[PDB]
Design an enzyme around this catalytic site. Structure first.
Site, short mmCIF file in Angstrom:
data_model
loop_
_atom_site.label_atom_id
_atom_site.label_comp_id
_atom_site.label_asym_id
_atom_site.label_seq_id
_atom_site.Cartn_x
_atom_site.Cartn_y
_atom_site.Cartn_z
N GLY A 190 41.07 41.71 -30.74
CA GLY A 190 42.08 42.71 -31.04
C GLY A 190 43.44 42.09 -31.34
N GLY B 209 36.97 38.09 -24.77
CA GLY B 209 36.62 38.07 -26.18
C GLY B 209 37.18 39.25 -26.95
CB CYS B 210 36.91 42.87 -26.24
SG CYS B 210 35.13 42.81 -26.29
CB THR B 211 41.79 40.64 -24.87
OG1 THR B 211 41.41 41.59 -23.87
CG2 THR B 211 43.29 40.56 -24.93
#
Ligand code: NA
Ligand code: NA
Ligand code: NA
Ligand code: NA
Ligand code: NA
Length: 157
Positions: A50, A45-47
């Site tokens: 970003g 999710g964080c990738t």
């Protein structure tokens, strides 16, 4: 117009960045700032989040805004994440959760028979005068960066 009032000291906190420098929120006076909090470097999710912001960076540049991502991972972790993904904006290593607490993104859940605290994915839009004019909490990644850009364009006009 503020949706959140930060402690005055927040704006002078030294924020450790990927690449080994520091910034402060006050240092960003004069332009719009998107601050996106995410739970963990190098996770799906964080990738995705970003990379979504990174792909829109020229649109943020047009509109007079900078982006900062924030988690509590180390500078080294952030350097690895930025290098692997090709991010062209900085990541704040908020290792002590000072910035996270100021924005009230550390949330408690009753689970595992305990009270468990963690970063809630959240984004904020800071005006050129340091006012928090829009907040998104418990963010769903899909479509989020697009929505933040649209809101920025609406506010900046
Ligand atoms: Na530092
Ligand atoms: Na630091
Ligand atoms: Na440093
Ligand atoms: Na600002
Ligand atoms: Na909101």
């Amino acid at each position: 117009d503020a949706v959140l009032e930060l402690p005055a000291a927040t704006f002078d906190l030294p924020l450790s960045l990927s690449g080994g420098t520091q910034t402060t929120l006050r240092a960003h006076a004069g332009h719009w700032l998107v601050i996106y909090f995410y739970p963990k470097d190098s996770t799906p999710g964080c990738t995705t989040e970003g990379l979504d912001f990174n792909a829109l960076l020229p649109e943020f540049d047009k509109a007079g805004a900078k982006i900062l991502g924030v988690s509590r991972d180390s500078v080294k972790s952030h350097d690895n994440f930025c290098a692997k993904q090709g991010f062209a904006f900085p990541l704040v290593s908020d290792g002590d959760e000072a910035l996270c607490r100021a924005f009230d993104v550390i949330k408690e859940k009753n689970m595992y028979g305990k009270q468990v605290l963690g970063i809630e994915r959240s984004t904020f839009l800071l005006s050129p005068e340091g006012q928090v004019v829009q907040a998104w909490r418990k963010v769903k990644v899909a479509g989020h960066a697009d929505a933040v850009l649209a809101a920025l364009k609406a506010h900046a006009k």
